[PDB]
Amino acid sequence: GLPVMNTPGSNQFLTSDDFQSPSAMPQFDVTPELDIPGEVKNLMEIAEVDSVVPVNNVVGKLDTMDIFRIPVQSGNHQSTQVFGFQVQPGLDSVFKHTLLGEILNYYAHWSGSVKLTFVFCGSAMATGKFLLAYSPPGANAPKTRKDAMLGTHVIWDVGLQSSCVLCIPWISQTHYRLVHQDEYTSAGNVTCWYQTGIVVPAGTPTLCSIMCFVSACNDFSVRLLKDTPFIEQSALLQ
Amino acid sequence: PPQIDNGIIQGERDHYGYRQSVTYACNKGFTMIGEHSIYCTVNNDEGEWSGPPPECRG
Amino acid sequence: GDVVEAIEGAVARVADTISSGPTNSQAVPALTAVETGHTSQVVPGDTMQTRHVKNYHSRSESTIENFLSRSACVYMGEYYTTNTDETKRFASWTINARRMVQMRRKLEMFTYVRFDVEVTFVITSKQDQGTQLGQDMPPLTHQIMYIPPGGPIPKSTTDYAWQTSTNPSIFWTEGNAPPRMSIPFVSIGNAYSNFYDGWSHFSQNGVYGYNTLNNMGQLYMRHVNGPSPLPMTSIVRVYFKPKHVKAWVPRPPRLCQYKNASTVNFSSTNITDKRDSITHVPDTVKP
Amino acid sequence: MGAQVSTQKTGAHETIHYTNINYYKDAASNSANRQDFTQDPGKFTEPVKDIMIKSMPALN
Amino acid sequence: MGAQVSTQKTGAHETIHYTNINYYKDAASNSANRQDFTQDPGKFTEPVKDIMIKSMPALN
């Protein structure tokens, strides 16, 4: 009988612990391993993949494919903003259900840059330039293109390359932000403006669409596993 | 769609079908309280608006 | 390496930020083609000037092991200690992780998974309400039998099947640590299938989906003390913690609410939540 | 004894090991491999033949 | 990493390896030993002292 003393935490079931147990099936011969394509070793490999952002999440469109298309058109419309949202990649109804947003809502802390790729889906004959502007927090969202072009912007010229990348860099006061973001860990906003119109010939549709893809850059990371606020049930057998 | 006191429907259409939306706007000097728009739901072959229109209060 | 064997720290940081000055060239990293099914590998240094940032962040908590190796409730089952009906004095459960919604949604983020399980039980008795509640019952012992497919199913609490000559069983008396045992990877295929697009019968009918490939057996639970003078209820909660996890073919996270455990049936769900307009960003700097 | 000596999850910038012995005979009974940090995002991003340079236009 | 490299179940006549890493700390948590093919039918057949030659009459 070796002398021994039990410490607090004995006979508790911590759901996160990591101890050896006895096998209920001793010497069980496990099936051989099969080289299946597409093995995941980190959820960040998943969140690094684009997913169509629902930027047009306005009423009457939440159940349609029109929720994905940002409408652009020809004419003098520079006085109007194409779109704008908050960079809350796990709280904003524009991002919470994207691949990145879903992976985010399993954690409490996120860090790193986020790519927004924009894709033009008009005719090959339609041409246009856009200003895509990410503004860090501390001021209101810009109301004019003159204000938006003071933040981090890209002037996207539409051509044979149909997509532009606006990388939102990590400009934070803290190493991590909260996925459930409040005013302390705010991250800014993204807006779009017509830089130089949309010019189209005759016999061509004058109103086209833009698509938004969100993904996480290679410096992105998460912290503090938690449960999603998304899936819920009232009873078992479900 | 129902009309509202001290507000208008923006470009009211003749016929509203499934998931189509009606956008309300208050007249000058009046404050909107409620949903900016409502949309057409359809169940058991009968249409019904998603909820009450907004209030425009002075 | 006979008495002690060292192990090198597998530490994996995220990528640094490389410093980028001003540019004017024919290189265009911000210009790409999503039509290729290829995600752009652009870093922030391509679209703006960046300082050098040495990054010490890690992705250790998004590893598949660290994402899945958490104990999660898969079943909650009641059974009585005394009752005129006999099928109420014990509990059955067909083993599947599809009835509690959180762990199901976590697992269904991948098409195939292969892991061992750590099964913990949390058994909790309570005295039912009644006119008389005074009694002195000794501690309640519980038997949890694992019946693999084909073994004899018990019909009562006194059945011969509870002899557990070969089926693995755990006896545990109340007041002690929760019972916990390990389970190897016990599929007949090379991995578990969260999804089975297919049928049980070659005539392309019968059962559709997860239930054709899913037969791990059942769990039976009873009290061993026999009936109490006054009614008592034991609730057994089953917690699975996968370990030594491998996952293949990730899937888009379940957006709709689960309806039952037999199927993937769902009510049609909005893509996301509505806002006021497409440009709507509410002011946060105001008096 | 057949002890393994690995490194604990510490910080990366602020100013140590843990011992493990396996007691059971089956490997299904060990503790989780909490520290396996290899990666390959290229199966899912850039899953194309004809690798893309990220400086070249990516078309034409 | 502590990778094992074994051979996949292929054919025996028609014209390759798989990698395994153990992530968990308990051996009860590994995958099944699907490829252990040793044999000994002599415990059950011919379980006799005085081995029988199969050419000799086996009696007398």
Next chain:
Amino acid sequence: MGAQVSTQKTGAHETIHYTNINYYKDAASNSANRQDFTQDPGKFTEPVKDIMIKSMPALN
């Protein structure tokens, strides 16, 4: 095969080995480590700095 050959629990005074092969791929699936007999009663008995000599008075 990757066989382990250990010693069976025998007596200590009266006048042998057993073989083990792990078939499964996970360590959670091995058999219990029934033979790990290291000890340290000093965590619980004598858990004090200023070790006590057991011959000295233990105070003053």
Next chain:
Amino acid sequence: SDRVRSITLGNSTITTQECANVVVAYGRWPEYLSDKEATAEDQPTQPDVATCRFYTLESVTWEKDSPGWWWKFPDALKDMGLFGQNMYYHYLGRAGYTIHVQCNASKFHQGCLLVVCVPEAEMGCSDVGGTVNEHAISEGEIAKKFSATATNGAHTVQSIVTNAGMGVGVGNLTIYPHQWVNLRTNNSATIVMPYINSVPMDNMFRHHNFTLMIIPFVSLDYSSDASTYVPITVTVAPMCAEYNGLRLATSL
């Protein structure tokens, strides 16, 4: 230029002059089954030209309001010559695939299609208490159409396109092997799927290994006097196909 691409399998060739690229599903090419990974003992069949060749399904008509189409692809090829026959006479079969989706238009049409290859795209019923038919999830070479609104039918799929019949976000379908047919950029997409399963081979009648979905995200648009007819063709070439368990033929 890299916009030209030729793919030759068997006696079939596909040229394209507006190739985006080729998606090799998870960076893995179809391969035959090895000995270290096999489980079925008899000698396999490897026709390798008679079966590994492009088969063209019936076209679909991209209209201005189409929600999208899908095929369950181990199925859908059971009348395709010797591939279908070898599916019929064997209990086990195994193949990767080259999917090529063709959709050309003019420089004045606009539209964007997502072409996804979803492994194990198990679908749900329109009645959330019911189960689907085989006819509900597949029709052979005929395409199964998505819906723009929630469907109400027992034994049919919930085919509103935003949920993809799978209870997910449609916009997240890009986690799978996918390409985009942007009319202003593309006219063809091609995905190379290896064999994906939890077992080395399976029955090619019972189990739908993957579903090909073609969903227009940006609608088909053109101004009047332009061609109103835009078709979409799918061409599927099995790859490294082998079969085991030969007996009499299944009679569906």
Next chain:
Amino acid sequence: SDRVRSITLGNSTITTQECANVVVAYGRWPEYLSDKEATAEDQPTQPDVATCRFYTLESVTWEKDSPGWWWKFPDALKDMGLFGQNMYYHYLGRAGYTIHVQCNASKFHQGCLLVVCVPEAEMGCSDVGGTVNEHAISEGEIAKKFSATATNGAHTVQSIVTNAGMGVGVGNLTIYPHQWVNLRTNNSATIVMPYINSVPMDNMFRHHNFTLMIIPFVSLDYSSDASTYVPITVTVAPMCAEYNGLRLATSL
């Protein structure tokens, strides 16, 4: 002699001239968290003087019939200057402790106190169908009193001292880090607790890491004309304390 002992942490010193010894809980000294064992990613705070210093709680009065007192100690220090503030502003916190229990008397008083540090001393309700309050198990710096008889109150602890609120034998409490204040031998006890948990850090509001119990086994006795007032003071110094997850402050 080894009866003298000084302990200096921060700007605080405790001398004792009748030290028994120092119990280092399981032979382990408090340590900061390392990299091989951490899980939270942001940089920790290590005040290390502002927080790692002796704090004195309110005394208790040893009477001739006192059953005993307890404190839930991660709690109970939430008004103690910057230790309390750092508990309030961070989501995670971690510390070991130096507990010093002071109880002096004369050479003519007799008594024996057991001073235990019980990890995870989860307590039970007086109604065996009910659950406890937070007020029932803790009162901050105020001591929670044991009872000499079984208590009957819903939402309160079963605080009869022989069961220690834990459903055990009181005389077995010596399995934990403990000391004895024997009046004829001692006037102070000191235990050095490291951080004990199943996780590297935790919330210092939600989880009571350990309970300090002070139970008189031999009652306080003295003959008349002697001092009837004998107090018992507890002095707790956090050690190697660090915090993670800084945000706005909790408002209890």
Next chain:
Amino acid sequence: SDRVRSITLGNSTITTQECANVVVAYGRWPEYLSDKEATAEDQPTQPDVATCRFYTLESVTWEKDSPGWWWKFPDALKDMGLFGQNMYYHYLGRAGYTIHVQCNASKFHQGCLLVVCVPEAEMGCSDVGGTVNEHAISEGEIAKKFSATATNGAHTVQSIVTNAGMGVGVGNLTIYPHQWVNLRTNNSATIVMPYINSVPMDNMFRHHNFTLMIIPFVSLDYSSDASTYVPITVTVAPMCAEYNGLRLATSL
């Protein structure tokens, strides 16, 4: 380009895409106090993440006729989490600062702001026989407004902007660490102040180490239909902050 700049302190990051540069006040970076220069004997506290992080004060509204605003900055941060708490519980404290002033507009707005960090900006009363209040010279996070005309109030500051409350020329304020927010060039300025004093540490309640002034030299102008609202945000990150002399908390 060098117009982009990221500053990361603690759990806070600021990006700017129209950085002018960074002014390091006198070419000196904040540093901790050494042994050859210290005078207080006890061990300091160095939270270093809990306190050395960006804090955002309330914005101000740049109008077409604003004279300017100021903050007394050792003050003004006394509700900022653990920085404020460590100011409250210690007698001595010491920190440098990263000041970041954010003011974006459009390319059609015009304006120029001088952002100065004035050490020991001692101010004078509006009654030249009277003395100021603490409320007259500081309001915490609230900005103190300059005046366009001479003020007449006892116990208030002479806040006509041309004299800067200091009895000097406003246009000479460029002798101090300063930047300019030119709307046609900038939207942010950043000054890195070390600790400046005639003593190594001081009380962070009693002594205002420096004042941040934001004075529009060229007025805010824009033609109609443009945004009339232009805010100005200040973000302050203490740096290399340490504290000595821990006791109970001051109660202002």
